[PDB]
PDB file of N, CA, C and O in Angstrom:
ATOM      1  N   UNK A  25       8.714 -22.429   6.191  1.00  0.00           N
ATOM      2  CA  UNK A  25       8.915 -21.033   5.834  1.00  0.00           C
ATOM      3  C   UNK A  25       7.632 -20.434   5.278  1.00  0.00           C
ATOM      4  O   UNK A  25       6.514 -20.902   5.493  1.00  0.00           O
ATOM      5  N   UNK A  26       7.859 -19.492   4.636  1.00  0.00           N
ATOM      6  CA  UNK A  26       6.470 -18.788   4.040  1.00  0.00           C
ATOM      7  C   UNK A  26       6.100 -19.232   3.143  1.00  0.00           C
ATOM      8  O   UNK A  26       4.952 -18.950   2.799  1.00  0.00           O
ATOM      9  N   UNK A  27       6.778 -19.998   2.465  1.00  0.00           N
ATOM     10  CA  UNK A  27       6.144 -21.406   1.137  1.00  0.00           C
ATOM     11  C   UNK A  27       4.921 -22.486   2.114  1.00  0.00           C
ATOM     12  O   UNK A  27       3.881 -22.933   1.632  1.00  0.00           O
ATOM     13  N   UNK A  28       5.316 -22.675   3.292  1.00  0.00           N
ATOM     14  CA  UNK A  28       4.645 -23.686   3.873  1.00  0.00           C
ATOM     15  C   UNK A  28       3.518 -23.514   4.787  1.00  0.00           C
ATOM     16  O   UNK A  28       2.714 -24.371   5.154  1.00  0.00           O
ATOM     17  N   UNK A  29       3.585 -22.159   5.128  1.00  0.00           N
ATOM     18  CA  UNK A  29       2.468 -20.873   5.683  1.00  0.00           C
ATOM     19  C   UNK A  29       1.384 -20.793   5.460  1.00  0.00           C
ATOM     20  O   UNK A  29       0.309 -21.104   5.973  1.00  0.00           O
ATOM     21  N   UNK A  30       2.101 -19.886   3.808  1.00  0.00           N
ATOM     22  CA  UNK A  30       0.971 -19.319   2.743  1.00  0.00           C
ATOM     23  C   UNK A  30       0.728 -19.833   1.539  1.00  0.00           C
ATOM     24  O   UNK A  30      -0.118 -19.348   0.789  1.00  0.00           O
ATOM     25  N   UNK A  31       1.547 -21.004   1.201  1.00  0.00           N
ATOM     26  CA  UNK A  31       0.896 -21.414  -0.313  1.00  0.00           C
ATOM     27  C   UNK A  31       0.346 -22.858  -0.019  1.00  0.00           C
ATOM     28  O   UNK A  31      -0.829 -23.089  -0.305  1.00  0.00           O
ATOM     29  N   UNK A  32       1.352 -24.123   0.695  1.00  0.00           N
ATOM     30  CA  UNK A  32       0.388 -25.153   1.212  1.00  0.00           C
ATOM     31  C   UNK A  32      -0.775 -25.019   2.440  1.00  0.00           C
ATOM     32  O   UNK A  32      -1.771 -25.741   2.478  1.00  0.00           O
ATOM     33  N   UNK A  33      -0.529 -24.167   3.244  1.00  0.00           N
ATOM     34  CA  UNK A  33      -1.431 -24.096   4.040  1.00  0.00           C
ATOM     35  C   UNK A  33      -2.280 -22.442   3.727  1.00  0.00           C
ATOM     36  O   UNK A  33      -1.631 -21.665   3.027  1.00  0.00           O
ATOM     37  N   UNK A  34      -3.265 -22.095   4.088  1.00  0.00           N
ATOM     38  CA  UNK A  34      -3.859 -20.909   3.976  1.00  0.00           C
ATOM     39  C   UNK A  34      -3.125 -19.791   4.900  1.00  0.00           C
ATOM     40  O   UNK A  34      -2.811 -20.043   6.064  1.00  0.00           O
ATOM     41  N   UNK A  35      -2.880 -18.553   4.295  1.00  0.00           N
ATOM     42  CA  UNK A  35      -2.053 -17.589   4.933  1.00  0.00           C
ATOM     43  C   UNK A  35      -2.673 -16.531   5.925  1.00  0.00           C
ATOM     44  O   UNK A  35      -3.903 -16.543   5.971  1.00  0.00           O
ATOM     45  N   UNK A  36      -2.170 -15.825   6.544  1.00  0.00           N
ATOM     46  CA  UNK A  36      -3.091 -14.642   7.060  1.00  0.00           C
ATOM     47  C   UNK A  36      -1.953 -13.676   7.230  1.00  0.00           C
ATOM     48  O   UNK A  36      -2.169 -12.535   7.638  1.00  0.00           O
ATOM     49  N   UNK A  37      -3.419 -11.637   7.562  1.00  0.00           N
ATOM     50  CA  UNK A  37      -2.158 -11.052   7.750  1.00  0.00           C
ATOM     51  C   UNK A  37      -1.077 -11.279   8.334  1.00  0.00           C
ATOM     52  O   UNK A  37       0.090 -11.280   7.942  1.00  0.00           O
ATOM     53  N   UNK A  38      -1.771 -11.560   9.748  1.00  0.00           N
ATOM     54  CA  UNK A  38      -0.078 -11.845  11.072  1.00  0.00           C
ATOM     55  C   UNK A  38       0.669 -11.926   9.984  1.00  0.00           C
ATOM     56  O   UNK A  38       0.688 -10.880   9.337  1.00  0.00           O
ATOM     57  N   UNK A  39       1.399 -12.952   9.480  1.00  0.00           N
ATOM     58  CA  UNK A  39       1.879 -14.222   8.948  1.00  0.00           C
ATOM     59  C   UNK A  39       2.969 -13.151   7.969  1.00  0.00           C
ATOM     60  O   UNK A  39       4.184 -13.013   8.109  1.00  0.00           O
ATOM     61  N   UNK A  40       2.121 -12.536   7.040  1.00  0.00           N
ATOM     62  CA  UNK A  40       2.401 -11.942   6.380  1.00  0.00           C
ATOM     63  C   UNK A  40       3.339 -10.763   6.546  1.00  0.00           C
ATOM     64  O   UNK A  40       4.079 -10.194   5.743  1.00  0.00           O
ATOM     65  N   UNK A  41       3.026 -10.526   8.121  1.00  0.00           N
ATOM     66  CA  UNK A  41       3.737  -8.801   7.907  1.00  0.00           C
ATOM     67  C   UNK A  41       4.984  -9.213   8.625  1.00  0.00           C
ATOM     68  O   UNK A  41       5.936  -8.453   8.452  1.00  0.00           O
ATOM     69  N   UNK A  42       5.153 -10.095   9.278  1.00  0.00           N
ATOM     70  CA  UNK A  42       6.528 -10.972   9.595  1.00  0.00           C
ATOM     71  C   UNK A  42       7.913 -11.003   8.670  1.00  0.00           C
ATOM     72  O   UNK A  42       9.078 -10.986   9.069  1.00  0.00           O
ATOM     73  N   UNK A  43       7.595 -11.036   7.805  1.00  0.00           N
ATOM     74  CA  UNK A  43       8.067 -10.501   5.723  1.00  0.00           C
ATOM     75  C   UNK A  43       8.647  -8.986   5.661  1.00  0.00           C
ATOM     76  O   UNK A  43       9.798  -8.609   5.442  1.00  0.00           O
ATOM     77  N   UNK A  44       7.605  -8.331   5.895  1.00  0.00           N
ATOM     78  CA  UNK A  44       7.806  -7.001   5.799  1.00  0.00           C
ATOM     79  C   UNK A  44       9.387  -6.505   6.647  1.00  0.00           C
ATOM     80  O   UNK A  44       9.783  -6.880   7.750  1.00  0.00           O
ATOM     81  N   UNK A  45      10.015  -5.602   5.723  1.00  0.00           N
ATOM     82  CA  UNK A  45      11.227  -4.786   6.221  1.00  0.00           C
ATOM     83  C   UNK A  45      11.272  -3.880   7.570  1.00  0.00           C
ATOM     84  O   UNK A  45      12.298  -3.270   7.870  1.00  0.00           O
TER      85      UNK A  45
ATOM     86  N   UNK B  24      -7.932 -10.022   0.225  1.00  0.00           N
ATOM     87  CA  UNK B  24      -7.125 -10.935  -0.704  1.00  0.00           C
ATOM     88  C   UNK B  24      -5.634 -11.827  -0.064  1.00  0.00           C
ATOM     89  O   UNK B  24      -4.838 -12.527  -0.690  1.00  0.00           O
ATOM     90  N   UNK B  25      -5.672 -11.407   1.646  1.00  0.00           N
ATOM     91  CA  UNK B  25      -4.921 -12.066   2.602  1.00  0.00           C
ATOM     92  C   UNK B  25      -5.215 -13.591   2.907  1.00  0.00           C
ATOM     93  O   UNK B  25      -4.405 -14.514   2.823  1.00  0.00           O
ATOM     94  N   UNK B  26      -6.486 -13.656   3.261  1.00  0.00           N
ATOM     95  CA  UNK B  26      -6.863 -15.005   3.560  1.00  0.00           C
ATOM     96  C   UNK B  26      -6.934 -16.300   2.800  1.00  0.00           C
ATOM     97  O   UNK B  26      -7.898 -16.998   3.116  1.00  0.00           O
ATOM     98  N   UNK B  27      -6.308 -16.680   2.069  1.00  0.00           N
ATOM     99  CA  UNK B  27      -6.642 -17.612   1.317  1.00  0.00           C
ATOM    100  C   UNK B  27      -4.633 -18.236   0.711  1.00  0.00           C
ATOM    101  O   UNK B  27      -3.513 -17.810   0.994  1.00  0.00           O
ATOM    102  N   UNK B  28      -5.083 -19.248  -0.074  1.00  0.00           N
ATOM    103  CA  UNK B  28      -3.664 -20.027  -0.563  1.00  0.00           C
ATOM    104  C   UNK B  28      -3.076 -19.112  -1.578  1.00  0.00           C
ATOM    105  O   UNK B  28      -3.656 -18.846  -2.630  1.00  0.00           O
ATOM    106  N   UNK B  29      -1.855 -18.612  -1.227  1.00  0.00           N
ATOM    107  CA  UNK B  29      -0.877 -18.041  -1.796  1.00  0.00           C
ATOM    108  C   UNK B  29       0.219 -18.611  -2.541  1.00  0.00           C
ATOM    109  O   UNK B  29       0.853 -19.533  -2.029  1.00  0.00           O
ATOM    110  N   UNK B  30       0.518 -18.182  -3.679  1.00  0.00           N
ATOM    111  CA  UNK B  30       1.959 -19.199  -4.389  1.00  0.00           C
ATOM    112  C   UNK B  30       2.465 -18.099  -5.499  1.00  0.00           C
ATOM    113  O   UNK B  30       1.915 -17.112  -5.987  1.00  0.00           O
ATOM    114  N   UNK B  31       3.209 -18.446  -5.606  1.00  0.00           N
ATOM    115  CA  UNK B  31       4.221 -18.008  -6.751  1.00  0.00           C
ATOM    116  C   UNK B  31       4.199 -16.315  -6.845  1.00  0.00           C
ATOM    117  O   UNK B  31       4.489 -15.537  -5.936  1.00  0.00           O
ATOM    118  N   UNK B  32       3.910 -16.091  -7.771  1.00  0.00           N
ATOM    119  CA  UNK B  32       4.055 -14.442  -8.688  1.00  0.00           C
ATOM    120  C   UNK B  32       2.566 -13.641  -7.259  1.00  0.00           C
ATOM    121  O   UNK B  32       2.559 -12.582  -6.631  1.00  0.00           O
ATOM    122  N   UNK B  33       1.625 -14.743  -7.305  1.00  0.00           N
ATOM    123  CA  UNK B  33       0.197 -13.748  -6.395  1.00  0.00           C
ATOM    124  C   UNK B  33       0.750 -14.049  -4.701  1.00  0.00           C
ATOM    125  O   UNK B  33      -0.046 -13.781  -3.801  1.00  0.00           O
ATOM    126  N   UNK B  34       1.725 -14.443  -4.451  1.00  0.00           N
ATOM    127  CA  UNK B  34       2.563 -14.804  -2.759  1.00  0.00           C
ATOM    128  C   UNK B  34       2.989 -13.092  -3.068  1.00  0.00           C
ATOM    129  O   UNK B  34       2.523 -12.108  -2.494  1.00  0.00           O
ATOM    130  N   UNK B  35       4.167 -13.140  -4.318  1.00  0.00           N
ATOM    131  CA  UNK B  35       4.737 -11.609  -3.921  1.00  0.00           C
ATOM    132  C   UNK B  35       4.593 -10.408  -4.055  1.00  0.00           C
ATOM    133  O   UNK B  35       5.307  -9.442  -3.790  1.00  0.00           O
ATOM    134  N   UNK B  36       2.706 -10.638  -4.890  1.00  0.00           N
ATOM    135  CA  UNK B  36       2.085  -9.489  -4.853  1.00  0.00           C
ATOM    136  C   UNK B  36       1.352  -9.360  -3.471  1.00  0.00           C
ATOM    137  O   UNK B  36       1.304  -8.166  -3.173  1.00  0.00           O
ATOM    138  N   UNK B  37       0.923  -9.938  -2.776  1.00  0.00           N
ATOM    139  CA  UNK B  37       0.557  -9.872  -1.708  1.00  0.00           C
ATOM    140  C   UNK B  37       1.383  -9.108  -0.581  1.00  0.00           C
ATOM    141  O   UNK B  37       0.979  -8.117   0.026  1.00  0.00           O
ATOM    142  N   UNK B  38       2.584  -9.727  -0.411  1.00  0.00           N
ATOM    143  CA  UNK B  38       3.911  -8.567   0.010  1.00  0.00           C
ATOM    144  C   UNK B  38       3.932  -7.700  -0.342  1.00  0.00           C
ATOM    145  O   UNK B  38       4.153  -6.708   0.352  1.00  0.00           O
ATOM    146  N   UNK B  39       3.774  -7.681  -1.226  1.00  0.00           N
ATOM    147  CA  UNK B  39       4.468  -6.298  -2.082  1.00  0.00           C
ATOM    148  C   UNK B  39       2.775  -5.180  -2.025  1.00  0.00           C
ATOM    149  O   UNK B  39       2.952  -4.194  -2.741  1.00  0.00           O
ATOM    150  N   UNK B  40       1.692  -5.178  -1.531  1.00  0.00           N
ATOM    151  CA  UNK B  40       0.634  -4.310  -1.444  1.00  0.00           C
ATOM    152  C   UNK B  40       0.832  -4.337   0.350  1.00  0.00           C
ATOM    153  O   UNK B  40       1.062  -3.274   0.927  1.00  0.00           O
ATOM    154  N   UNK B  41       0.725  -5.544   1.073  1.00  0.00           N
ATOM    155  CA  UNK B  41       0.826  -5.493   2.114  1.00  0.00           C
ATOM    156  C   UNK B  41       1.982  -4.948   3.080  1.00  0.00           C
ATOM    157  O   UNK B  41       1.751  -4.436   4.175  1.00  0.00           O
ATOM    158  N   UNK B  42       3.534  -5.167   2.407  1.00  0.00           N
ATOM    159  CA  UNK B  42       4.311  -4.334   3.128  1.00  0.00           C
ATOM    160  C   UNK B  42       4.431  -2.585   2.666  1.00  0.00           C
ATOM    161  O   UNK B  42       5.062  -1.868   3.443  1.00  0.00           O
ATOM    162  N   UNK B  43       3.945  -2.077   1.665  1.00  0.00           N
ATOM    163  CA  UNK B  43       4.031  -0.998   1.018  1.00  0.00           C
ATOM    164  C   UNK B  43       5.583  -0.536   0.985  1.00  0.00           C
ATOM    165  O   UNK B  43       6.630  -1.050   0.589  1.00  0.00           O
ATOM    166  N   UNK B  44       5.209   0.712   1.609  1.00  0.00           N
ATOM    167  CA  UNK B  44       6.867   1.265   1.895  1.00  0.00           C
ATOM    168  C   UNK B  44       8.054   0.934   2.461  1.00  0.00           C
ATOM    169  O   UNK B  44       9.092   1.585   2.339  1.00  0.00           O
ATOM    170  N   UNK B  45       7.924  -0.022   3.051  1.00  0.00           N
ATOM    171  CA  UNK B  45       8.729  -0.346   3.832  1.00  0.00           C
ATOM    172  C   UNK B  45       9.632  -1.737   2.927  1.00  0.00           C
ATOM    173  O   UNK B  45      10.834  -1.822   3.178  1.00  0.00           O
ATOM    174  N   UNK B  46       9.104  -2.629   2.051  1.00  0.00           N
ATOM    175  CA  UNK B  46       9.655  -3.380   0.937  1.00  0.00           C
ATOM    176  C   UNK B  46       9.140  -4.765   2.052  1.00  0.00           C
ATOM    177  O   UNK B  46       8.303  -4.816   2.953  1.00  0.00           O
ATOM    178  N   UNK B  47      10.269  -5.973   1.365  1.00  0.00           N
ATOM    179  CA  UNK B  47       9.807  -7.029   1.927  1.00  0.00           C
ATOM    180  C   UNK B  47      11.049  -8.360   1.619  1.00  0.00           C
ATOM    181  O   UNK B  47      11.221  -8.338   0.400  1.00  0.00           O
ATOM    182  N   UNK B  48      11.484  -8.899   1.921  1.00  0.00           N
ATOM    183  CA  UNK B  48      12.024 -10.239   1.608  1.00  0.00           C
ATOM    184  C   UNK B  48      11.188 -11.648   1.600  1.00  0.00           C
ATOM    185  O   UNK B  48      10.418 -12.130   2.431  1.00  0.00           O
ATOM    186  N   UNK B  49      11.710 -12.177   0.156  1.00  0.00           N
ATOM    187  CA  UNK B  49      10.755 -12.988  -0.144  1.00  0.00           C
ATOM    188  C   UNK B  49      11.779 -14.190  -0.254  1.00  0.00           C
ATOM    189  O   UNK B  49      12.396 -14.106  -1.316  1.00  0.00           O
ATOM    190  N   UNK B  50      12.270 -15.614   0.738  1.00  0.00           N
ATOM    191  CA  UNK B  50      12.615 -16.730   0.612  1.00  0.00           C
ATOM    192  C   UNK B  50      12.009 -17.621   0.569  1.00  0.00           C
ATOM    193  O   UNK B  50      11.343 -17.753   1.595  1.00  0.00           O
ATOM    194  N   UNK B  51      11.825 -18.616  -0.363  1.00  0.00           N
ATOM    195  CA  UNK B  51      11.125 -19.736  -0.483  1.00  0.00           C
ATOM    196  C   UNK B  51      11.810 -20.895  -0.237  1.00  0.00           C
ATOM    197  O   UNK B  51      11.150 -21.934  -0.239  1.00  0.00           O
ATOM    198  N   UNK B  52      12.774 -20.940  -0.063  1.00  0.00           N
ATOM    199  CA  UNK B  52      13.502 -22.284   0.406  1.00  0.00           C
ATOM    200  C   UNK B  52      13.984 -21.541   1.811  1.00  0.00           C
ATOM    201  O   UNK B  52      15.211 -21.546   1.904  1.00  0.00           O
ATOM    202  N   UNK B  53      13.404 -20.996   2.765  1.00  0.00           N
ATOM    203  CA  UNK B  53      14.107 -21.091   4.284  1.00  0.00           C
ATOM    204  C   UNK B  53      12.722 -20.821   4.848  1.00  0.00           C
ATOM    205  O   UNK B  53      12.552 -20.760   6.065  1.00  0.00           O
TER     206      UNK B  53
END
Protein backbone atom coordinates (compact mmCIF):
# COMPACT_ATOMS: atom_id res chain seq x y z
CA UNK A 1 0.00 0.00 0.00
CA UNK A 2 1.18 3.56 0.37
CA UNK A 3 3.07 2.63 3.68
CA UNK A 4 5.20 0.38 1.38
CA UNK A 5 5.49 2.95 -1.66
CA UNK A 6 6.32 5.97 0.22
CA UNK A 7 7.75 5.41 3.60
CA UNK A 8 9.88 1.98 3.08
CA UNK A 9 10.62 2.58 -0.31
CA UNK A 10 11.14 6.27 -1.79
CA UNK A 11 7.83 7.87 -3.10
CA UNK A 12 7.04 9.95 -6.15
CA UNK A 13 4.38 12.25 -7.52
CA UNK A 14 2.63 9.47 -9.80
CA UNK A 15 2.35 7.47 -6.66
CA UNK A 16 1.04 10.08 -4.77
CA UNK A 17 -1.83 11.52 -6.68
CA UNK A 18 -3.34 7.91 -6.88
CA UNK A 19 -4.49 9.08 -3.02
CA UNK A 20 -6.01 12.04 -4.12
CA UNK A 21 -10.10 12.24 -4.19
CA UNK B 1 9.50 17.62 -1.10
CA UNK B 2 7.81 14.52 -3.24
CA UNK B 3 10.84 12.57 -3.85
CA UNK B 4 12.18 11.17 -1.00
CA UNK B 5 11.02 8.60 2.21
CA UNK B 6 7.76 9.50 3.55
CA UNK B 7 6.16 8.29 7.03
CA UNK B 8 3.87 9.18 9.50
CA UNK B 9 2.45 12.91 10.26
CA UNK B 10 5.19 14.28 6.91
CA UNK B 11 3.29 11.05 4.49
CA UNK B 12 -0.05 13.18 5.27
CA UNK B 13 1.28 16.41 4.83
CA UNK B 14 2.46 15.58 1.62
CA UNK B 15 -1.26 14.57 0.59
CA UNK B 16 -2.65 16.98 2.04
CA UNK B 17 -0.40 20.03 -0.13
CA UNK B 18 -0.35 17.65 -3.04
CA UNK B 19 -4.04 16.73 -3.34
CA UNK B 20 -5.23 20.38 -2.39
CA UNK B 21 -8.89 20.70 -3.05
CA UNK B 22 -9.90 17.86 -3.89
CA UNK B 23 -8.88 16.04 -0.13
CA UNK B 24 -7.31 12.60 0.00
CA UNK B 25 -7.59 9.13 1.78
CA UNK B 26 -4.95 8.06 3.80
CA UNK B 27 -4.77 3.90 4.64
CA UNK B 28 -1.88 2.47 6.07
CA UNK B 29 -2.76 -0.98 6.60
CA UNK B 30 -4.28 -1.70 2.86
Amino acid sequence: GIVEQCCTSICSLYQLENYCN
Amino acid sequence: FVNQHLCGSHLVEALYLVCGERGFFYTPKA
